[PDB]
Amino acid sequence: MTQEEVRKIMEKLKKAFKQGNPEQIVSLLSPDVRVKVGNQEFSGSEEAEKMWRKLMKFVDRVEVRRVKVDENRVEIEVEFEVNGQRYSMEFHFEVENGKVRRVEIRISPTMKKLMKQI
């Protein structure tokens, strides 16, 4: 995969987060996208859509702080507002064939308790 293509997906991802629209994200996901959140792993674009829709509907606002691109891997640092508080979580994407094959969501310790509700 070409870095220009990898950068293209990254822009759409950042656009998807900024818009706050779930529809843009699902189109980017592979049918068999593997999602890792801490010690828990699951797969499927349908099962993924559930938590992403639950997450973005939960948060009042969502903002992209930092973006990193290395080979086919794209890191997007995302900030949001919950309970009058700013918190962040990192989205580590593995991108293949114009879609996202694998996503790892690393979440901050302070943001690690209320998030069992996702």
List the strands of the sheet with 99-107, edge to edge.
40-43, 29-37, 99-107, 86-96, 73-81, 62-70
Record the tokens describing residue 100, joined without a space. Answer: 């996202």
Q: Amino acid identity, residue 29?
A: L
Q: Amino acid identity, residue 51?
A: M
Q: Amino acid identity, residue 63?
A: E
Is the Cβ–Cβ distance between 45 and 30 less than 8 Å? yes
Q: Name the residue among 108, 88, 98 with its Cα closest to residue 13.
A: 98
